[PDB]
Amino acid sequence: GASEENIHFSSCKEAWANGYSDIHEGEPGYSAKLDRDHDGVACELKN
């Protein structure tokens, strides 16, 4: 179970290198701490 555990990425560039894209609520990086525009998605890859 991939629960959130105080995860902190320096940038979405490092998140994408681990396959972390289209992050939803309750996943690591959904917060304003990752998504500069805080639009309720993180490291989005929807074309």
Ligand SMILES: [Ca+2]
């Ligand atoms: Ca965004």
